[model samples]
Target: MVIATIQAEDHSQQSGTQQETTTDTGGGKNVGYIDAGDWLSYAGTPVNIPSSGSYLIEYRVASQNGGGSLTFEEAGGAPVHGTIAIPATGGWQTWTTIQHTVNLSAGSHQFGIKANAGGWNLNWIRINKTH
Candidate 1:
């Protein structure tokens, strides 16, 4: 198994996003002010998938309105890996982990997160490969 942990605010490129201090487990900054057309790109620190298999992709997110969604895909929005819904946790900083499993190929790839719906804040992402 291989794992990669990417902080949301560490994106190399972003569109219509804001970063702020977080009260989550790591005490780092998070990406907020994300609307429907916002996205964060991690082209600088590409993830290396050692094997082609199912992986657990987790997003540490918080939402006040619950009806939010995001897509994990290659940079520039092609070949989406998967999408997950963000649930409301009472407040913005009320963090929770939302995860989904996806099958990925073996290679180093720049990943990006596209906000499908608004009203959510992302702190970090964990990609764990399980063969």
Candidate 2:
């Protein structure tokens, strides 16, 4: 069983009310408004997992103002798996969790999160492996 968690922190170097967990980079940013793309890493490093079976992916956010979604891809950036739409309703402090049963093989994988609407602060992600 393999377990992993990804936490989102405020990396944006902004101040005042505009300061938020996610940052907005203008000029047709591919990610989205208020996005923290490619910032999360495992133990401050990126590595490939050796094996995979059944995993329980859990995510909690400080706020769900802008609902966030998650996606997975192969080592070569090929689309592999993704979850359904996650709506943002509860504000910060209210946590939400989603459990997914995924069948992963022995290979490398990539995960991504996208915010569609509203605004949200991702607290952390927990992945429980249940073989």
Candidate 3:
């Protein structure tokens, strides 16, 4: 399986509540400004999967209070892909990478992340195609 990296802040359109901050790893550009209780703030970007397969979904995040869940699925439609738990690493700016497995079809689809709870800061996402 080959791993691919995608920045959370790099998007076409995003919620007004979602703001960008330049203060983290991977060149100091990261998605930090967030609001709880709203799914819209969780995602506003779409990643183009080059192939169809099961991908190990890895998200880079940080938080002060990190006990939460995030559900990722095909945006603008149905079919829930996968939901992952956010572990309390230590504090906000204390970055870590968490991963899971999810199957996706081939094509152009907007994968959306829904905030099942709060207290998490998303930096980037990495998807690895497992053969």
Candidate 4:
């Protein structure tokens, strides 16, 4: 069986839609926020990795309806992976981590997120190195 390499590296939250909002989560100020119509490209944001391969992009999210989804993409606006479902964790501040696998090369890269079907919120995202 093949093993995986996991890195605890993290990136800050970036917002796309004008409908985004935020509050003190005891995490950080303006740690990124999204509403029913929010999504953004991390192309302008920096997420540095030691070397690229397969990695886990974990999202801290919350929802009320439990049927929304999210998508991830590469720096060039190409989809790296995703359109994954976001589970309803009951409250807006009530967050949980969801992850997706993606591949990339070494150097600087930005990822994008598109909100689908609406009714969810994002706190922050962690990009961890995984093989």
Candidate 5:
């Protein structure tokens, strides 16, 4: 299957967040001003995972000081899929791809990314089947 590229700024429901132009590879807007309690929900278009298996979830992230973390899970925080460490890319506009493998049930579900630690910028998310 083709990898799904979900833009961070295209979230349907969000809290304590803002969007700003980005100089990353895509040269588009990104979700910024994220704090520990901020979250970006992708409920507008839920992903219909084809099969139950390991999937590689990638986040296009940029952080200046590093030490940031985020939780990728179902909206409302239940059934946490994975937690990723956001490493510093030298500057806010410096981009890097951070990813983790997570098991997803075969079904359609809304997803969300919750900021566990702040100080990072997100451009997009890519979900690719690993098996």
Candidate 6:
């Protein structure tokens, strides 16, 4: 099994109706500053897991302002998986972490992360095979 760690850049500083940043990890992009009903989707090249196993999916929110949350969904599949809620902070100097485990089989799969209301700054993320 291979362990991969991906860092999500700061998109909260961008100016626009909806801010977005493309990340090379998972061939997915991180998006923020969206309206209540808006969302961002990223489709990357399929990742092939060697076999059915337990993996750790970690998400870290470095900073959040004006209150926001992030939702993780499996692309091309039914039922959204994870939804993380973030509290309002005065600035982008705070840190928070959320981790979850997902079981995957040997095949191609796609995953995405999206923000709601206000904005969020992501510092780092990782997908690793559990020991």
Q: lDDT per model, in order? A: 0.91, 0.45, 0.70, 0.59, 0.92, 0.54
Report the candidate with higher TM-score, 3 versus 6. Answer: 3
Each prediction's TM-score against the native? 0.96, 0.54, 0.79, 0.69, 0.97, 0.58
Ranking by TM-score: 5, 1, 3, 4, 6, 2
Query: What lDDT, from 0 to 1, does candidate 4 have?
Result: 0.59
Q: Total clashes, candidate 1? A: 0
At residue 2, what lDDT does model 3 achieve?
A: 53
lDDT of 6 at 112: 55
Single out the weakest 10-residue window by summed lDDT for candidate 5: 1-10
Cand. 5 Cα-lDDT: 0.92
CA lDDT for candidate 2: 0.45
Cα lDDT tens digits for candidate 3, 7-123 = 776655455336456456655566555654444422344566777878889988887876778787766425677989998878877888899999888766676666767777888
**Candidate 5 Cα outliers beyond 4 Å, as residue runs:** none
The lDDT-based order of candidates, best leading, equals 5, 1, 3, 4, 6, 2
**What lDDT does candidate 5 reach at residue 64?**
89
lDDT of 2 by residue, 58-88 (tens): 6554444645554543323345544534456
User: How do the residues 28-128 of candidate 4 rate in per-residue lDDT, one tens digit apiece?
Assistant: 32223445445565554665666857777777777766787877766444745655788988876577778787776777667667666566766666677
Error of 5 at 50 (Å): 0.5
TM-score of model number 3: 0.79
lDDT of 6 by residue, 1-131 (tens): 44555444422222233434443234334434454444433344334566677777776553445467666665543336566666654445455556777776666555555555546655566677786
Q: Over all chains combined, what TM-score does candidate 4 have? A: 0.69
As for lDDT, the candidate ahead, 1 or 6, is: 1
